[PDB]
CSV table of C-alpha atoms and ligand atoms in Angstrom, one decimal:
chain,number,residue,atom,x,y,z
A,1,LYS,CA,0.0,0.0,0.0
A,2,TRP,CA,3.1,2.2,-0.4
A,3,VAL,CA,4.6,3.5,-3.7
A,4,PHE,CA,8.4,3.9,-3.7
A,5,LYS,CA,9.7,7.5,-3.8
A,6,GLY,CA,13.5,7.4,-3.1
A,7,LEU,CA,16.4,5.6,-1.5
A,8,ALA,CA,19.4,6.7,0.5
A,9,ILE,CA,21.8,3.8,0.7
A,10,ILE,CA,25.2,3.6,2.4
A,11,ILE,CA,27.5,0.9,1.1
A,12,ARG,CA,30.7,-0.5,2.6
A,13,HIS,CA,33.8,-1.2,0.4
A,14,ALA,CA,34.3,-4.5,-1.3
A,15,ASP,CA,36.7,-7.4,-0.5
A,16,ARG,CA,40.3,-6.5,0.2
A,17,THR,CA,43.6,-8.2,0.9
A,18,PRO,CA,44.7,-8.5,4.6
A,19,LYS,CA,47.3,-6.0,5.9
A,20,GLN,CA,50.6,-7.7,6.6
A,21,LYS,CA,54.0,-6.7,8.0
A,22,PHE,CA,57.4,-8.4,8.4
A,23,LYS,CA,59.8,-7.0,11.0
A,24,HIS,CA,63.4,-7.7,11.7
A,25,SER,CA,66.6,-5.8,12.5
A,26,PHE,CA,70.0,-6.1,10.8
A,27,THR,CA,73.5,-4.8,11.5
A,28,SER,CA,75.4,-5.6,8.3
A,29,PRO,CA,76.8,-2.6,6.5
A,30,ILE,CA,74.7,-3.3,3.4
A,31,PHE,CA,71.6,-3.0,5.5
A,32,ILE,CA,72.8,0.2,7.2
A,33,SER,CA,73.8,1.8,3.8
A,34,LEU,CA,70.2,1.7,2.6
A,35,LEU,CA,69.4,4.6,5.0
A,36,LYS,CA,71.4,6.9,2.7
A,37,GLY,CA,73.0,8.5,5.7
A,38,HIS,CA,69.8,9.4,7.4
A,39,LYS,CA,69.7,8.8,11.2
A,40,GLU,CA,65.9,8.9,11.6
A,41,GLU,CA,63.0,6.8,10.3
A,42,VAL,CA,63.0,6.5,6.5
A,43,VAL,CA,59.9,5.5,4.5
A,44,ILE,CA,60.3,4.1,0.9
A,45,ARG,CA,57.3,3.9,-1.3
A,46,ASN,CA,58.7,4.9,-4.7
A,47,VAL,CA,58.7,1.8,-6.9
A,48,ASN,CA,62.1,2.9,-8.3
A,49,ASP,CA,63.5,2.9,-4.7
A,50,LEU,CA,61.8,-0.4,-3.9
A,51,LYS,CA,63.6,-2.0,-6.8
A,52,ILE,CA,66.9,-0.6,-5.5
A,53,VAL,CA,66.1,-2.1,-2.0
A,54,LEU,CA,65.2,-5.4,-3.7
A,55,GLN,CA,68.6,-5.6,-5.4
A,56,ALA,CA,70.2,-5.0,-2.0
A,57,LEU,CA,68.6,-8.2,-0.6
A,58,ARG,CA,70.0,-10.2,-3.5
A,59,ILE,CA,73.4,-8.9,-2.7
A,60,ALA,CA,72.9,-9.4,1.0
A,61,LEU,CA,71.8,-13.0,0.4
A,62,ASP,CA,75.1,-13.7,-1.5
A,63,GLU,CA,76.8,-13.1,1.8
A,64,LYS,CA,75.6,-15.4,4.6
A,65,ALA,CA,77.5,-13.3,7.2
A,66,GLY,CA,74.2,-11.5,7.9
A,67,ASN,CA,71.1,-13.7,8.4
A,68,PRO,CA,70.4,-15.2,5.0
A,69,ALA,CA,67.2,-16.8,6.1
A,70,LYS,CA,65.6,-13.4,6.7
A,71,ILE,CA,67.0,-12.1,3.4
A,72,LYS,CA,65.4,-14.9,1.5
A,73,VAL,CA,61.9,-14.2,2.8
A,74,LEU,CA,62.3,-10.4,2.6
A,75,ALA,CA,63.6,-10.4,-1.0
A,76,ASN,CA,60.6,-12.5,-2.3
A,77,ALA,CA,58.2,-10.4,-0.2
A,78,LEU,CA,59.6,-7.1,-1.5
A,79,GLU,CA,59.6,-8.2,-5.2
A,80,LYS,CA,56.1,-9.7,-5.1
A,81,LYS,CA,54.5,-6.8,-3.3
A,82,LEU,CA,56.6,-3.8,-4.5
A,83,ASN,CA,54.3,-3.8,-7.6
A,84,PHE,CA,51.3,-3.2,-5.3
A,85,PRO,CA,50.2,0.3,-4.2
A,86,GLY,CA,50.6,0.7,-0.4
A,87,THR,CA,53.6,-1.6,-0.1
A,88,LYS,CA,56.2,0.3,1.9
A,89,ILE,CA,59.3,-0.1,4.0
A,90,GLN,CA,60.0,1.6,7.4
A,91,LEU,CA,63.6,1.8,8.5
A,92,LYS,CA,63.8,2.6,12.2
A,93,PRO,CA,67.5,3.2,13.1
A,94,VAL,CA,69.0,2.3,16.5
A,95,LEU,CA,71.6,4.7,17.8
A,96,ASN,CA,74.3,3.8,20.3
A,97,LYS,CA,75.8,6.1,23.0
A,98,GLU,CA,78.0,7.8,20.3
A,99,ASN,CA,75.1,8.6,17.9
A,100,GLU,CA,76.2,5.9,15.6
A,101,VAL,CA,73.8,3.6,13.7
A,102,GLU,CA,74.7,0.1,14.8
A,103,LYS,CA,71.5,-1.6,13.5
A,104,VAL,CA,68.4,-0.7,11.5
A,105,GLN,CA,64.9,-2.0,12.0
A,106,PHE,CA,63.5,-3.3,8.6
A,107,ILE,CA,59.7,-3.2,8.6
A,108,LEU,CA,58.1,-4.2,5.3
A,109,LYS,CA,54.3,-3.4,5.2
A,110,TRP,CA,51.9,-4.4,2.5
A,111,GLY,CA,48.4,-5.6,1.9
A,112,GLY,CA,45.1,-3.8,2.4
A,113,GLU,CA,44.4,-3.4,-1.3
A,114,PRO,CA,41.0,-4.4,-2.8
A,115,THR,CA,41.2,-8.0,-4.1
A,116,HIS,CA,40.6,-8.9,-7.7
A,117,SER,CA,37.1,-10.0,-6.4
A,118,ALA,CA,36.2,-6.5,-5.3
A,119,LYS,CA,35.4,-5.3,-8.8
A,120,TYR,CA,32.9,-8.2,-9.3
A,121,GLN,CA,31.1,-7.6,-6.0
A,122,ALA,CA,30.7,-3.8,-6.7
A,123,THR,CA,29.8,-4.5,-10.4
A,124,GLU,CA,27.1,-7.1,-9.5
A,125,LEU,CA,25.6,-4.7,-7.0
A,126,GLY,CA,25.5,-1.8,-9.4
A,127,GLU,CA,23.8,-3.8,-12.0
A,128,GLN,CA,21.2,-5.1,-9.5
A,129,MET,CA,20.5,-1.5,-8.4
A,130,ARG,CA,20.0,-0.5,-12.0
A,131,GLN,CA,17.7,-3.4,-12.5
A,132,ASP,CA,15.7,-2.6,-9.4
A,133,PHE,CA,15.5,1.1,-10.3
A,134,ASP,CA,14.5,0.6,-13.9
A,135,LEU,CA,11.6,-1.4,-12.6
A,136,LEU,CA,10.3,1.0,-10.0
A,137,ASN,CA,10.8,4.3,-11.8
A,138,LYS,CA,13.2,5.0,-14.7
A,139,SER,CA,13.5,8.7,-13.7
A,140,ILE,CA,15.4,7.7,-10.6
A,141,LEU,CA,18.5,6.8,-12.8
A,142,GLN,CA,18.4,10.5,-13.9
A,143,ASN,CA,18.7,11.5,-10.2
A,144,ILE,CA,21.7,9.5,-8.9
A,145,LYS,CA,24.2,11.1,-6.6
A,146,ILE,CA,27.3,9.3,-5.4
A,147,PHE,CA,29.9,10.1,-2.7
A,148,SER,CA,33.0,8.3,-1.5
A,149,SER,CA,35.7,8.6,1.1
A,150,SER,CA,39.4,9.3,0.4
A,151,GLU,CA,40.5,5.7,0.8
A,152,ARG,CA,41.5,4.0,-2.4
A,153,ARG,CA,39.6,0.8,-1.7
A,154,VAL,CA,36.4,2.8,-0.9
A,155,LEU,CA,36.5,4.8,-4.1
A,156,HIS,CA,37.4,1.6,-6.0
A,157,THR,CA,34.1,0.1,-4.8
A,158,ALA,CA,32.3,3.4,-5.6
A,159,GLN,CA,33.8,3.5,-9.1
A,160,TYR,CA,32.9,0.0,-10.1
A,161,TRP,CA,29.4,0.2,-8.6
A,162,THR,CA,28.8,3.5,-10.5
A,163,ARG,CA,30.0,2.0,-13.7
A,164,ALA,CA,27.8,-1.1,-13.2
A,165,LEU,CA,24.9,1.2,-12.3
A,166,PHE,CA,25.2,3.0,-15.7
A,167,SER,CA,33.2,14.8,-14.9
A,168,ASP,CA,33.5,12.7,-11.7
A,169,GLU,CA,30.1,11.5,-10.7
A,170,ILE,CA,31.6,10.4,-7.4
A,171,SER,CA,32.1,13.4,-5.0
A,172,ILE,CA,34.7,12.7,-2.3
A,173,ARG,CA,33.4,13.9,1.0
A,174,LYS,CA,36.0,13.5,3.7
A,175,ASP,CA,33.9,15.2,6.4
A,176,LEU,CA,31.1,12.6,6.1
A,177,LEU,CA,32.8,9.3,5.1
A,178,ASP,CA,36.4,9.7,6.4
A,179,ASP,CA,37.6,8.8,9.9
A,180,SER,CA,38.3,11.3,12.7
A,181,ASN,CA,41.2,10.9,15.1
A,182,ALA,CA,39.1,11.8,18.1
A,183,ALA,CA,36.7,9.0,17.5
A,184,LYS,CA,39.4,6.5,16.6
A,185,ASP,CA,41.0,7.3,20.0
A,186,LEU,CA,37.6,6.5,21.7
A,187,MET,CA,37.4,3.2,19.9
A,188,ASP,CA,40.9,2.5,21.2
A,189,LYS,CA,39.9,3.3,24.7
A,190,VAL,CA,36.9,0.9,24.2
A,191,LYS,CA,39.5,-1.6,22.9
A,192,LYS,CA,41.3,-1.2,26.3
A,193,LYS,CA,38.0,-2.2,27.9
A,194,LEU,CA,37.9,-5.3,25.7
A,195,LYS,CA,41.1,-6.8,27.0
A,196,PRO,CA,39.7,-7.7,30.5
A,197,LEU,CA,36.5,-9.2,28.9
A,198,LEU,CA,38.6,-12.0,27.4
A,199,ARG,CA,40.9,-12.4,30.4
A,200,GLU,CA,40.3,-14.0,33.8
A,201,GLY,CA,36.8,-15.4,34.1
A,202,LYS,CA,34.2,-12.9,32.7
A,203,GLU,CA,30.9,-14.4,31.6
A,204,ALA,CA,29.8,-11.7,29.1
A,205,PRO,CA,27.2,-10.4,31.7
A,206,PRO,CA,25.2,-8.3,29.2
A,207,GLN,CA,24.2,-9.5,25.8
A,208,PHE,CA,27.8,-8.7,24.5
A,209,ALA,CA,26.9,-10.3,21.2
A,210,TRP,CA,27.9,-13.7,22.6
A,211,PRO,CA,26.4,-17.2,22.0
A,212,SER,CA,24.8,-18.7,25.1
A,213,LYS,CA,26.0,-22.1,24.0
A,214,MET,CA,29.6,-21.0,24.1
A,215,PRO,CA,31.7,-21.2,27.4
A,216,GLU,CA,33.5,-18.3,29.1
A,217,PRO,CA,35.3,-16.0,26.7
A,218,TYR,CA,38.5,-17.1,28.5
A,219,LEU,CA,37.7,-20.8,27.7
A,220,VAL,CA,36.9,-20.0,24.1
A,221,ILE,CA,40.2,-18.1,23.7
A,222,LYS,CA,42.1,-20.9,25.4
A,223,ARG,CA,40.7,-23.5,23.0
A,224,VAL,CA,41.5,-21.5,19.9
A,225,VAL,CA,45.1,-21.3,20.9
A,226,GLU,CA,45.2,-25.1,21.2
A,227,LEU,CA,43.8,-25.4,17.7
A,228,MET,CA,46.3,-22.9,16.3
A,229,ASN,CA,49.2,-24.8,17.9
A,230,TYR,CA,47.7,-28.0,16.4
A,231,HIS,CA,47.4,-26.7,12.8
A,232,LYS,CA,50.9,-25.1,12.8
A,233,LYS,CA,52.4,-28.5,13.6
A,234,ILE,CA,50.3,-29.9,10.8
A,235,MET,CA,51.6,-27.2,8.5
A,236,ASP,CA,55.2,-28.0,9.5
A,237,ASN,CA,54.6,-31.7,9.0
A,238,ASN,CA,53.1,-31.1,5.6
A,239,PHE,CA,55.9,-28.7,4.6
A,240,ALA,CA,58.5,-31.4,5.6
A,241,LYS,CA,56.8,-34.3,3.8
A,242,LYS,CA,54.8,-32.9,0.8
A,243,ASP,CA,55.5,-30.7,-2.2
A,244,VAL,CA,54.2,-27.3,-1.1
A,245,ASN,CA,54.6,-25.8,-4.6
A,246,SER,CA,52.0,-28.3,-6.0
A,247,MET,CA,49.3,-27.8,-3.3
A,248,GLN,CA,47.4,-25.1,-5.3
A,249,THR,CA,47.3,-24.6,-9.0
A,250,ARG,CA,46.2,-20.9,-8.9
A,251,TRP,CA,47.7,-18.0,-7.0
A,252,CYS,CA,46.2,-14.6,-7.0
A,253,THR,CA,47.6,-11.2,-5.8
A,254,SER,CA,51.1,-12.5,-6.4
A,255,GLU,CA,50.9,-14.8,-3.4
A,256,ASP,CA,52.9,-18.0,-3.1
A,257,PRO,CA,53.5,-20.7,-0.4
A,258,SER,CA,56.2,-18.6,1.3
A,259,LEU,CA,53.9,-15.5,1.8
A,260,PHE,CA,51.2,-17.9,2.9
A,261,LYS,CA,53.5,-19.4,5.5
A,262,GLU,CA,54.5,-15.9,6.7
A,263,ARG,CA,50.9,-14.9,7.4
A,264,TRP,CA,50.2,-18.0,9.5
A,265,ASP,CA,53.6,-18.1,11.2
A,266,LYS,CA,52.8,-14.6,12.5
A,267,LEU,CA,49.3,-15.6,13.6
A,268,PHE,CA,50.6,-18.8,15.2
A,269,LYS,CA,53.0,-16.7,17.2
A,270,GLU,CA,50.2,-14.4,18.3
A,271,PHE,CA,47.9,-17.3,19.1
A,272,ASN,CA,50.3,-19.6,21.0
A,273,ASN,CA,49.3,-18.3,24.5
A,274,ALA,CA,45.7,-17.9,25.5
A,275,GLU,CA,46.6,-15.6,28.4
A,276,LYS,CA,48.4,-13.3,25.9
A,277,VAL,CA,46.0,-13.2,23.0
A,278,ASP,CA,45.4,-9.5,22.2
A,279,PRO,CA,41.7,-8.7,21.4
A,280,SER,CA,42.8,-6.5,18.5
A,281,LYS,CA,44.6,-9.5,17.0
A,282,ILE,CA,41.5,-11.6,17.2
A,283,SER,CA,40.1,-9.5,14.3
A,284,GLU,CA,43.4,-10.1,12.5
A,285,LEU,CA,43.1,-13.9,12.7
A,286,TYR,CA,39.5,-13.8,11.4
A,287,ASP,CA,40.3,-11.6,8.4
A,288,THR,CA,43.1,-13.9,7.2
A,289,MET,CA,40.8,-16.9,7.6
A,290,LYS,CA,38.2,-15.3,5.3
A,291,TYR,CA,40.9,-14.4,2.7
A,292,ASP,CA,42.5,-17.8,2.4
A,293,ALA,CA,39.1,-19.5,2.5
A,294,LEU,CA,38.2,-17.3,-0.5
A,295,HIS,CA,41.5,-17.1,-2.4
A,296,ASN,CA,43.7,-20.0,-1.2
A,297,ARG,CA,41.4,-22.9,-0.3
A,298,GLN,CA,43.4,-25.4,-2.3
A,299,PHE,CA,46.7,-24.7,-0.5
A,300,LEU,CA,44.8,-24.2,2.8
A,301,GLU,CA,43.4,-27.7,2.6
A,302,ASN,CA,46.6,-29.5,1.7
A,303,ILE,CA,48.9,-27.5,4.0
A,304,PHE,CA,46.5,-28.2,6.9
A,305,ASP,CA,45.7,-31.8,5.9
A,306,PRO,CA,46.4,-34.1,8.9
A,307,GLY,CA,47.0,-36.9,6.4
A,308,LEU,CA,45.0,-40.0,5.5
A,309,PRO,CA,44.2,-42.9,7.8
A,310,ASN,CA,45.7,-45.6,5.5
A,311,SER,CA,38.9,-31.6,-2.3
A,312,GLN,CA,36.9,-30.1,0.6
A,313,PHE,CA,37.1,-29.4,4.3
A,314,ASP,CA,34.2,-31.7,5.0
A,315,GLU,CA,35.9,-34.6,6.8
A,316,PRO,CA,36.2,-35.8,10.4
A,317,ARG,CA,39.9,-35.4,9.6
A,318,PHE,CA,39.3,-31.7,9.1
A,319,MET,CA,37.1,-31.4,12.2
A,320,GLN,CA,39.9,-29.6,14.1
A,321,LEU,CA,39.8,-26.9,11.4
A,322,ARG,CA,36.0,-26.3,11.3
A,323,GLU,CA,35.8,-25.9,15.1
A,324,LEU,CA,38.7,-23.4,14.9
A,325,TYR,CA,36.8,-21.5,12.3
A,326,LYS,CA,33.6,-21.5,14.5
A,327,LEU,CA,35.5,-20.4,17.6
A,328,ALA,CA,37.2,-17.5,15.7
A,329,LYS,CA,33.9,-16.4,14.3
A,330,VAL,CA,32.4,-16.3,17.8
A,331,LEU,CA,35.3,-14.2,19.2
A,332,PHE,CA,35.2,-11.9,16.2
A,333,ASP,CA,31.5,-11.4,16.7
A,334,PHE,CA,32.1,-10.5,20.3
A,335,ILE,CA,35.0,-8.1,19.9
A,336,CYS,CA,34.5,-6.1,16.6
A,337,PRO,CA,31.0,-4.8,17.4
A,338,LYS,CA,32.3,-3.7,20.8
A,339,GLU,CA,35.3,-1.8,19.3
A,340,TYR,CA,32.7,0.9,18.4
A,341,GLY,CA,31.4,1.1,22.0
A,342,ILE,CA,30.5,-1.4,24.7
A,343,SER,CA,27.9,0.6,26.6
A,344,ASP,CA,25.0,2.4,24.9
A,345,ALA,CA,26.5,5.7,25.9
A,346,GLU,CA,29.9,4.6,24.4
A,347,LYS,CA,28.1,3.1,21.4
A,348,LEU,CA,26.2,6.4,21.2
A,349,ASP,CA,29.2,8.7,21.8
A,350,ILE,CA,31.3,6.9,19.2
A,351,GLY,CA,28.1,6.8,17.0
A,352,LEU,CA,27.8,10.6,17.0
A,353,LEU,CA,31.5,11.6,16.8
A,354,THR,CA,31.9,9.5,13.7
A,355,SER,CA,28.6,9.5,11.8
A,356,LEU,CA,26.9,12.7,12.9
A,357,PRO,CA,27.4,14.4,9.5
A,358,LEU,CA,26.4,11.4,7.5
A,359,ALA,CA,23.2,11.0,9.5
A,360,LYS,CA,22.2,14.7,8.8
A,361,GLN,CA,22.8,14.3,5.1
A,362,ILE,CA,20.6,11.2,4.8
A,363,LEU,CA,17.7,13.1,6.4
A,364,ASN,CA,18.2,16.0,4.0
A,365,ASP,CA,18.3,13.6,1.0
A,366,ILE,CA,15.0,12.1,2.1
A,367,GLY,CA,13.7,15.7,2.5
A,368,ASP,CA,14.8,16.4,-1.1
A,369,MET,CA,13.2,13.3,-2.4
A,370,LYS,CA,9.9,14.2,-0.7
A,371,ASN,CA,9.8,17.8,-1.8
A,372,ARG,CA,11.0,16.9,-5.4
A,373,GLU,CA,8.2,15.0,-7.1
A,374,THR,CA,10.8,13.1,-9.0
A,375,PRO,CA,12.2,10.1,-7.1
A,376,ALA,CA,16.0,9.9,-6.7
A,377,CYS,CA,18.7,7.8,-5.1
A,378,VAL,CA,21.9,8.8,-3.3
A,379,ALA,CA,24.7,6.3,-2.5
A,380,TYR,CA,27.5,6.8,0.0
A,381,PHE,CA,30.6,4.6,0.0
A,382,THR,CA,32.3,4.5,3.3
A,383,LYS,CA,34.6,2.4,5.4
A,384,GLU,CA,33.4,-0.3,7.8
A,385,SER,CA,33.6,1.9,10.9
A,386,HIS,CA,30.8,4.4,9.7
A,387,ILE,CA,28.4,1.5,9.1
A,388,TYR,CA,28.5,0.2,12.7
A,389,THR,CA,28.5,3.7,14.2
A,390,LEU,CA,25.6,4.9,12.0
A,391,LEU,CA,23.8,1.7,12.9
A,392,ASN,CA,24.4,2.5,16.6
A,393,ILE,CA,22.7,5.9,16.1
A,394,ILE,CA,19.7,4.1,14.6
A,395,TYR,CA,19.3,1.8,17.6
A,396,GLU,CA,20.2,4.4,20.2
A,397,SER,CA,17.5,6.7,18.7
A,398,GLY,CA,14.8,4.5,20.3
A,399,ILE,CA,13.1,3.7,16.9
A,400,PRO,CA,11.1,0.5,16.9
A,401,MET,CA,13.2,-2.2,15.3
A,402,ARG,CA,12.3,-5.4,13.5
A,403,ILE,CA,15.6,-7.0,14.2
A,404,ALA,CA,17.7,-6.8,17.4
A,405,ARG,CA,21.2,-5.4,17.3
A,406,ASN,CA,22.8,-8.6,18.6
A,407,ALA,CA,20.9,-10.6,16.0
A,408,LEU,CA,22.4,-8.6,13.1
A,409,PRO,CA,24.8,-10.6,10.9
A,410,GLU,CA,28.4,-9.5,10.4
A,411,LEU,CA,28.7,-6.2,8.6
A,412,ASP,CA,30.9,-7.7,5.9
A,413,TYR,CA,32.2,-6.2,2.6
A,414,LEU,CA,29.5,-4.3,0.6
A,415,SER,CA,27.3,-4.2,3.7
A,416,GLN,CA,24.4,-1.7,3.0
A,417,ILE,CA,22.1,0.4,5.0
A,418,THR,CA,19.1,1.9,3.2
A,419,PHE,CA,16.5,4.6,4.0
A,420,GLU,CA,13.8,3.8,1.4
A,421,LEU,CA,11.2,6.6,1.0
A,422,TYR,CA,7.6,5.8,-0.1
A,423,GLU,CA,4.2,7.4,-0.2
A,424,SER,CA,1.2,6.3,1.8
A,425,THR,CA,-1.3,5.3,-0.9
A,426,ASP,CA,-4.9,5.7,0.1
A,427,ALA,CA,-8.3,6.9,-1.3
A,428,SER,CA,-7.7,10.4,0.2
A,429,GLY,CA,-5.0,12.8,-1.2
A,430,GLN,CA,-1.9,14.2,0.5
A,431,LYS,CA,-0.2,10.9,1.2
A,432,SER,CA,1.6,10.9,4.6
A,433,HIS,CA,4.8,9.3,3.1
A,434,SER,CA,6.7,6.7,5.0
A,435,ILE,CA,10.3,5.5,5.6
A,436,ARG,CA,11.5,1.9,5.7
A,437,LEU,CA,15.0,0.9,6.9
A,438,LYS,CA,16.7,-2.1,5.4
A,439,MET,CA,20.2,-3.6,5.8
A,440,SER,CA,22.4,-6.0,3.9
A,441,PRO,CA,25.5,-7.7,5.5
A,442,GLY,CA,27.2,-7.5,2.1
A,443,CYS,CA,29.2,-10.4,0.5
A,444,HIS,CA,29.1,-12.7,3.6
A,445,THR,CA,28.7,-16.4,4.1
A,446,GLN,CA,27.9,-18.5,7.1
A,447,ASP,CA,29.9,-21.6,5.8
A,448,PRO,CA,33.1,-20.3,4.3
A,449,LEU,CA,34.5,-23.9,4.2
A,450,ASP,CA,31.4,-25.3,2.3
A,451,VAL,CA,30.6,-22.5,-0.2
A,452,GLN,CA,31.3,-23.4,-3.8
A,453,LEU,CA,33.8,-20.8,-5.1
A,454,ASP,CA,34.7,-19.7,-8.6
A,455,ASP,CA,38.2,-19.0,-9.9
A,456,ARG,CA,37.5,-15.3,-9.2
A,457,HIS,CA,37.3,-16.0,-5.4
A,458,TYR,CA,34.1,-14.1,-5.1
A,459,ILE,CA,31.1,-14.4,-2.8
A,460,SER,CA,27.6,-13.1,-3.8
A,461,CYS,CA,26.0,-10.3,-1.8
A,462,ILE,CA,23.2,-11.2,0.7
A,463,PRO,CA,19.9,-9.5,-0.1
A,464,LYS,CA,18.8,-6.6,2.1
A,465,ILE,CA,16.6,-7.2,5.1
A,466,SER,CA,14.1,-4.8,6.6
A,467,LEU,CA,15.2,-3.3,9.9
A,468,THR,CA,11.8,-1.5,10.3
A,469,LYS,CA,8.5,-1.3,8.6
A,470,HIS,CA,7.0,1.7,6.7
A,471,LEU,CA,7.4,4.4,9.4
A,472,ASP,CA,6.1,7.9,9.3
A,473,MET,CA,8.6,10.2,7.7
A,474,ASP,CA,8.4,13.0,10.2
A,475,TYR,CA,8.5,10.5,13.0
A,476,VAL,CA,11.8,9.0,11.8
A,477,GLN,CA,13.4,12.4,11.5
A,478,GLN,CA,12.4,13.4,15.0
A,479,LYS,CA,13.9,10.2,16.6
A,480,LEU,CA,17.2,10.9,14.9
A,481,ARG,CA,17.2,14.7,15.4
B,501,ZN,ZN1,41.9,-14.6,-5.4
């Protein structure tokens, strides 16, 4: 009994590669010479300079006086990832009592780029929106307005979505879609509140987005470490016995078995002591699990295959792995939502400091759509943080909800929040108009180890679900402001 009139949709960026960093210190003169005489931190991101550094590793490897083992991994890492935007080196010198550089800290950082699957996710979404729009009212395509944050991965999703939907049509708005240092500090302080939750014997007293079936967070964290120590030994055994270069026929993003080993070697180090697991590193583990389960399932299966008794993770042999996945999901679903505030006031305070501008703009867009007889649509592409915080504003506004905050699925890549505007169709004029809120968790799956994947390593987007029913326009604007 309602005719569509407009949509304000906020969309999260598409799939991206995990951020990764290798750290070690060297004292050999060849390593010190790379500083070019500088006695402070030096950052190298020019591809020309990265090639120069790369050659140094080949020369340093010729001489085993230094640590050749670290040179071997670093050289491959540098050459594979120096071709990627965002790959960088940080050189932190260490000065002795005579202001002489005796050793330099070599930090190689890379990752965080949108995967080759990102274009497909955004492209599919843009086409669907064009399809849906061309069926409701073709004039809406004539009234599309797109914004994006400054981050490359966000604009990347915005660009491909806009191309698929159809002079930069995307208008970068830092004030609305970009992060603020004040709020990120608050999220960090909330992060400091998360450390005790996993330690000692807390029993998630409030909802804390925690499954009732699961034991204490300190018991769950303890079991995960046991599984990690289990699989790392399986990995080592499989490295020692099997041909690792033949465990997967396809490698994307310039990855190879060595870089794969490095990701997990770091994670295994961070997940070898339950009483030391850092809550911020729980989110790190889960992100790597999604990536490999999407882009490196073949290698993942064989490198963690516990062997035969004597093409899928569905075996009692692979039971230790599925439980590890389930336990990681639980911990990720109990930490990440709470990084944006644990208490309603914190969830609210973080909610406003981050998404106060975006919330105002959405109301204005709906105001425009109502006053303008022509339906329209406005899309905002933002990072993951704004989605949670804006969602917090929605819940903390007291608006009647159709779905509980805890019951909401993970806000994965291409997660969407919609403010669909309609008209109240009756037999009397002057329709009262109505607003309906819907959400989509994006390209997310509940069974990463059972989903059938293509060579493109891509997951379809979950359809939107209604957070509310058709609610009075003026009423929805008053609750928010
Ligand atoms: Zn891939």
